[PDB]
A = this chain, B = another copy of it.
Amino acid sequence: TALVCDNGSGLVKAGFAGDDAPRAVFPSIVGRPRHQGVMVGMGQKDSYVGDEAQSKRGILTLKYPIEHGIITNWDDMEKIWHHTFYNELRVAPEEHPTLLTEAPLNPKANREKMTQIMFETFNVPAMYVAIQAVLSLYASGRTTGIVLDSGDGVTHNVPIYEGYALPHAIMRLDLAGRDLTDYLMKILTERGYSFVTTAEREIVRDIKEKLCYVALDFENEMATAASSSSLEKSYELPDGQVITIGNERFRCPETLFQPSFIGMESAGIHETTYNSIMKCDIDIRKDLYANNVMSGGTTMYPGIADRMQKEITALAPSTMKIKIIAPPERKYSVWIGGSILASLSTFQQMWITKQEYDEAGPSIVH
């Protein structure tokens, strides 16, 4: 049984092949103590991984091994992979052909190091690395293209025509969920609330998921928010305090369409989708326009499809049909597509085997 391990910047998605939902969806954080231990009872583990770090985040400094789709701390990454295999999956790595998903345009050394560590430290019989965006289209049962994948670290829109991922027409935007969390932390100081440490970042992140939404008309929404109190909501802090946010609800997600809110000179998600499509062939443009796929966890805000539909229609020939696909399972679409691909019997011929890694160069995966 293959293991489809889709590891991202924010969340780690792992589970057996042939299922429909990852078994272990836990944060990708490694925390270490920052205080002085007084009690001698219990060893007081020097490093917590996953939900253990989240529960004890008060006395820990949370760290992210992956920075924007790029692995930074290899030692922390090895700990997380060890935690997923033993503590979460409870299955040995040497008895399963694991499948991994890496971000598009990954450095060759990054992929070789991942393959080398997996084959040696975990002794996996075989492994294959697939593109995150392609699997999202696979889970949707399409081969059209323009798959907008926005997560915690990066935001990509990879076009895949007839199973062929067009490499030149791949646009990348650095703005993602983590930057939206930082933006909300900065503009939450207007009402007096102050969040600074890494533990507060998780608290603010939960606020953004529960309350923040997307407004199709920013100017009209701003006027109504400043003229009425209907938009204001409440959220109880872990220590019992009650906070109230008004126009901050529909302002934080607005950074996706207007990256200038966080000092970014790039284009929005709607403009970077339009630019990517026209870079493809003329015949493909009609195919991409009718079948546009929204994936990732960042695109889970209410009304995101309606705003995106209105935006793309503005930069449209006004005669083609613009349709956006937003499946309800878009948060786990990358893993669901990977699970389907692994379950395919025809796909079982494609696996980078161990002796091909050793008897040949480590670049055999490429």
Contact = CB atoms under 8 A, between A and B. Distances in A.
A82 interface: no
Interface string A196-209: 11111001000000
A39 B240 contact: no
Interface residues of A, number: 80
Contacts of A199: 281-283
A352 to B, nearest CB: 15
Nearest to A340: B41
Stoichiometry, as copies per complex, reads 4
A61, A107, A347: residue with the most chain B Cβ atoms closer than 10 Å: A107
Contacts of A317: 239-242
Contact of A344 (B34, B40, B174): B40
A145 to B, nearest CB: 12
Given A108-B190, A164-B44, A286-B239, A265 B197 contact: yes
A152 B40 CA distance: 28
Contact of A41 (B163, B240, B241, B281): B163
A100 to B, nearest CB: 16
Nearest to A190: B108
A236 B318 CA distance: 11
B282 A238 contact: yes
A301 interface: no
Please report whether the interface of chain A is mostly helix, strand, loop or mixed according to DSSP.
loop
A220 interface: no
A105 B186 contact: yes
Interface of A: 33-42, 44, 56-59, 61, 70, 105-109, 131, 134, 137-138, 143, 160-169, 174, 186, 189-192, 194, 196-200, 203, 236-242, 260, 262-263, 265-266, 279-286, 316-320, 341, 344, 346-347, 350
26 contacts: A38-B160, A38-B163, A39-B143, A39-B160, A39-B163, A40-B341, A40-B346, A40-B347, A41-B143, A41-B163, A58-B280, A59-B162, A59-B284, A61-B265, A107-B190, A108-B191, A109-B192, A168-B262, A169-B263, A199-B281, A236-B319, A237-B282, A238-B286, A239-B317, A240-B286, A240-B319
